[PDB]
Design an enzyme around this catalytic site. Structure first.
Site, PDB file in Angstrom:
ATOM      1  N   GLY A 173      -6.956  -2.955   1.973  1.00 23.51           N
ATOM      2  CA  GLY A 173      -7.844  -3.191   3.106  1.00 23.51           C
ATOM      3  C   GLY A 173      -8.755  -2.017   3.440  1.00 23.51           C
ATOM      4  O   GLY A 173      -8.493  -0.887   3.013  1.00 23.51           O
ATOM      5  N   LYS A 174      -9.790  -2.258   4.249  1.00 20.93           N
ATOM      6  CA  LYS A 174     -10.795  -1.238   4.526  1.00 20.93           C
ATOM      7  C   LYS A 174     -10.429  -0.520   5.820  1.00 20.93           C
ATOM      8  O   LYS A 174     -10.236  -1.161   6.873  1.00 20.93           O
ATOM      9  CB  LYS A 174     -12.195  -1.847   4.619  1.00 20.93           C
ATOM     10  N   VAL A 175     -10.340   0.811   5.718  1.00 23.30           N
ATOM     11  CA  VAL A 175     -10.002   1.716   6.808  1.00 23.30           C
ATOM     12  C   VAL A 175     -11.265   2.477   7.183  1.00 23.30           C
ATOM     13  O   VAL A 175     -11.784   3.263   6.385  1.00 23.30           O
ATOM     14  CB  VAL A 175      -8.887   2.689   6.390  1.00 23.30           C
ATOM     15  CG1 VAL A 175      -8.228   3.324   7.606  1.00 23.30           C
ATOM     16  CG2 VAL A 175      -7.855   1.991   5.511  1.00 23.30           C
ATOM     17  N   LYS A 188      -8.473  -0.843  10.686  1.00 24.23           N
ATOM     18  CA  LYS A 188      -8.032  -1.353   9.389  1.00 24.23           C
ATOM     19  C   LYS A 188      -8.177  -2.862   9.425  1.00 24.23           C
ATOM     20  O   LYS A 188      -7.478  -3.525  10.195  1.00 24.23           O
ATOM     21  CB  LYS A 188      -6.588  -0.969   9.075  1.00 24.23           C
ATOM     22  CG  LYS A 188      -6.320  -0.779   7.583  1.00 24.23           C
ATOM     23  CD  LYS A 188      -5.891  -2.073   6.913  1.00 24.23           C
ATOM     24  CE  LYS A 188      -5.392  -1.828   5.498  1.00 24.23           C
ATOM     25  NZ  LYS A 188      -6.409  -1.150   4.646  1.00 24.23           N
ATOM     26  N   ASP A 218       8.083   3.446   3.597  1.00 28.25           N
ATOM     27  CA  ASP A 218       7.085   4.068   2.730  1.00 28.25           C
ATOM     28  C   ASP A 218       6.659   5.436   3.270  1.00 28.25           C
ATOM     29  O   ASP A 218       5.482   5.806   3.224  1.00 28.25           O
ATOM     30  CB  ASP A 218       5.876   3.151   2.521  1.00 28.25           C
ATOM     31  CG  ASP A 218       5.039   3.545   1.302  1.00 28.25           C
ATOM     32  OD1 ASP A 218       5.578   4.246   0.406  1.00 28.25           O
ATOM     33  OD2 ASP A 218       3.848   3.142   1.230  1.00 28.25           O
TER      34      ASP A 218
HETATM   35  C1  LIG Z   1      -9.853   9.951   6.641  1.00 27.63           C
HETATM   36  C2  LIG Z   1      -9.590   9.253   7.957  1.00 27.63           C
HETATM   37  C3  LIG Z   1     -10.795   8.376   8.269  1.00 27.63           C
HETATM   38  C4  LIG Z   1      -9.328  10.311   8.997  1.00 27.63           C
HETATM   39  O1  LIG Z   1      -9.947  11.292   8.922  1.00 27.63           O
HETATM   40  N1  LIG Z   1      -8.334  10.192  10.035  1.00 27.63           N
HETATM   41  C5  LIG Z   1      -7.477   9.052  10.234  1.00 27.63           C
HETATM   42  N2  LIG Z   1      -7.142   8.156   9.372  1.00 27.63           N
HETATM   43  C6  LIG Z   1      -6.351   7.261   9.946  1.00 27.63           C
HETATM   44  C7  LIG Z   1      -5.702   6.100   9.474  1.00 27.63           C
HETATM   45  C8  LIG Z   1      -4.913   5.409  10.356  1.00 27.63           C
HETATM   46  C9  LIG Z   1      -4.242   4.246  10.124  1.00 27.63           C
HETATM   47  C10 LIG Z   1      -4.798   3.308   9.307  1.00 27.63           C
HETATM   48  C11 LIG Z   1      -4.153   2.121   9.110  1.00 27.63           C
HETATM   49  C12 LIG Z   1      -2.960   1.850   9.756  1.00 27.63           C
HETATM   50  C13 LIG Z   1      -2.418   2.753  10.574  1.00 27.63           C
HETATM   51  C14 LIG Z   1      -3.075   3.972  10.788  1.00 27.63           C
HETATM   52  C15 LIG Z   1      -1.246   2.160  11.062  1.00 27.63           C
HETATM   53  C16 LIG Z   1      -0.217   2.724  11.994  1.00 27.63           C
HETATM   54  O2  LIG Z   1      -0.027   3.853  12.059  1.00 27.63           O
HETATM   55  N3  LIG Z   1       0.577   1.863  12.786  1.00 27.63           N
HETATM   56  C17 LIG Z   1       1.553   2.428  13.663  1.00 27.63           C
HETATM   57  C18 LIG Z   1       1.746   1.488  14.827  1.00 27.63           C
HETATM   58  C19 LIG Z   1       2.834   2.637  12.909  1.00 27.63           C
HETATM   59  C20 LIG Z   1       3.289   3.899  12.674  1.00 27.63           C
HETATM   60  C21 LIG Z   1       4.441   4.099  11.980  1.00 27.63           C
HETATM   61  C22 LIG Z   1       5.145   3.023  11.542  1.00 27.63           C
HETATM   62  C23 LIG Z   1       4.692   1.761  11.796  1.00 27.63           C
HETATM   63  C24 LIG Z   1       3.532   1.568  12.472  1.00 27.63           C
HETATM   64  C25 LIG Z   1      -1.170   0.949  10.477  1.00 27.63           C
HETATM   65  N4  LIG Z   1      -2.183   0.789   9.719  1.00 27.63           N
HETATM   66  C26 LIG Z   1      -2.408  -0.382   8.947  1.00 27.63           C
HETATM   67  C27 LIG Z   1      -4.823   5.854  11.637  1.00 27.63           C
HETATM   68  C28 LIG Z   1      -5.472   6.994  12.011  1.00 27.63           C
HETATM   69  N5  LIG Z   1      -6.208   7.640  11.136  1.00 27.63           N
HETATM   70  N6  LIG Z   1      -6.910   8.771  11.346  1.00 27.63           N
END
Ligand SMILES: CC(C)C(=O)Nc1nc2cc(-c3ccc4c(c3)c(C(=O)N[C@@H](C)c3ccccc3)cn4C)ccn2n1
Ligand SMILES: CC(C)C(=O)Nc1nc2cc(-c3ccc4c(c3)c(C(=O)N[C@@H](C)c3ccccc3)cn4C)ccn2n1
Lengths: 261, 271
Positions: A12-14, A28, A121
């Site tokens: 997916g796209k972040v 995301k 993971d």
């Molecule tokens: C280079 C970049 C652009 C940057 O510079 N910084 C930056 N990249 C990110 C990427 C994410 C991100 C992306 C996709 C996510 C998540 C986070 C997430 C999540 O954490 N869910 C929480 C509720 C959770 C935690 C633990 C276990 C279970 C769930 C679930 N998905 C699908 C967040 C903040 N940043 N900040």
């Protein structure tokens, strides 16, 4: 949950997401296709569960966008990206900052286990760093929550406990994450991915299932002894022999306080 | 030959390339797969109609009959007979439970369709619950939603000017090996996992964590979890699926052999 609309964000796209009133966030987009309304109820429940994870070392879910054929998750922004990137950066991290990072990872993992979440993971791609060098645990791959995990599907193995290698049916436990964490410790002090060659295949899987671990002699920077003991203990092939994260914390916080802070 | 149809032969449609329920002004309900919408091309036209005649010759009660072809300027469509209740996975996960006798009949009908396709020299290559469609009487018909069987409509689907992939059933010999030629033994493996899915009412490998993990695990012998069947499942059917997902393709039975075993069993213990 907080329900957001695509119209709430600048167009997916972040991706970086600019909420028109609340500002910077992370988007995301999990699924874009023809509908699947029959799934929404379970997805919104798991989202609420996601929303209840509230800790300074855990990434916060700001909102969900649930729209016909478009599923998106909205998260808090972390300035400096993931742990590997910060480790391999052109500048260095004093041993004190690495000790603090490790303690923060332990605190977040203990919180997640106390809320009944098995990450499944944990890995450096999933440890985000803010501008002050504090960390938050993330789930970029949607591994932790089953229905969002499936929807995402409708890939490193270096941190996978040997019990899940070549066996996709055994249920993962808290000890799975403890193994992952042990490899994270090694990687923190090596500033590189384990298994120096860095190729993944059946040779390495079978080697790891038989007891091979990242090369403790591949540490080319100083690493405290007690931490090497901790990682050696945490990547024991026997899941029963690995500690729990609260046990790790009762060991590591006083050591970090007395020798690192 | 086939029936070459016109877009004007249909009053309307509703989306489900594009898959649509379409109402034929004379023939009634049919299923339309629009393969290509673009600038005109004879780059395959002749072969295309040839391939259509080929897929038109598959006529069996357990195979989706190709009803017509639409070849128009920049528009290519395949038209198939309509199956009321959709695919097998959907019917399994339905609120009403399915009787063990009806699952036995479904299995027998799949065996029959697969035997027919193999007897006409067709290797499905993509047998899975999504390609097993159910009529209103709970009879099944085998379908090819992904255009796996006929290569040049498949090419037409991927041509870069056309404006318009599960692995749980892929025999391990074709995982991480894009070159191995699929055989009838491939379709038997797929049949084995379909059997498991029929009795577990769900996709296999749910706590698989990552795709490389699952791929390497399956190639090394991992199979769907037979204990995760929580409804009654006869023991010969466990035997049949264990035999058909055997890692060695040569050890797997053929569909005529499977049918020889299964039909009397179904008659004496299931119908
Ligand atoms: C280079 C970049 C652009 C940057 O510079 N910084 C930056 N990249 C990110 C990427 C994410 C991100 C992306 C996709 C996510 C998540 C986070 C997430 C999540 O954490 N869910 C929480 C509720 C959770 C935690 C633990 C276990 C279970 C769930 C679930 N998905 C699908 C967040 C903040 N940043 N900040
Ligand atoms: C689920 C839906 C929501 C619903 O409710 N009903 C419903 N969906 C469908 C979908 C199809 C369908 C769609 C696309 C196809 C095919 C069939 C097909 C084919 O089967 N070709 C035949 C000749 C063949 C069979 C075996 C091997 C080789 C060829 C080739 N493509 C690209 C047919 C009937 N229905 N009914």
């Amino acid at each position: 949950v907080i329900k957001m609309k695509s119209s709430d964000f600048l167009e997916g796209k972040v991706s970086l997401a600019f909420h028109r009133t609340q500002g910077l966030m992370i988007m995301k987009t999990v699924y874009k296709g023809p509908n699947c309304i029959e799934h929404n109820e379970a997805l919104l429940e798991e989202a609420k569960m996601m929303n209840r994870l509230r800790h300074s070392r855990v990434v916060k879910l700001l909102g969900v966008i649930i729209e016909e054929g478009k599923y998106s998750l909205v998260m808090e922004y972390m300035e400096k990206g993931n742990l590997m990137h910060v480790l391999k950066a052109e500048m260095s991290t004093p041993l004190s900052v690495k000790g603090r990072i490790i303690l923060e990872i332990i605190e977040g993992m203990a919180y997640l286990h106390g809320k009944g979440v098995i990450h499944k993971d944990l890995k450096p791609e999933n440890i985000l760093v803010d501008n002050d060098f504090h960390i938050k645990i993330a789930d970029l791959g949607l591994a932790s929550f089953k229905m969002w995990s499936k929807l995402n599907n409708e890939g490193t193995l270096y941190y996978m406990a040997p019990e899940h290698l070549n066996d996709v049916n055994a249920k993962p436990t808290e000890k799975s994450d403890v193994y992952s964490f042990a490899v994270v410790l090694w990687a923190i002090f090596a500033n590189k991915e384990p298994y120096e060659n860095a190729i993944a295949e059946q040779q390495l899987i079978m080697a790891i299932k038989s007891g091979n671990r990242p090369d403790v002699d591949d540490i080319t920077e100083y690493c405290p002894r007690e931490i090497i003991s901790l990682m050696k203990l945490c990547w024991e092939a026997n899941p029963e022999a690995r500690p729990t994260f609260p046990g790790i914390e009762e060991k590591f916080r006083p050591f970090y306080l007395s020798q690192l802070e």
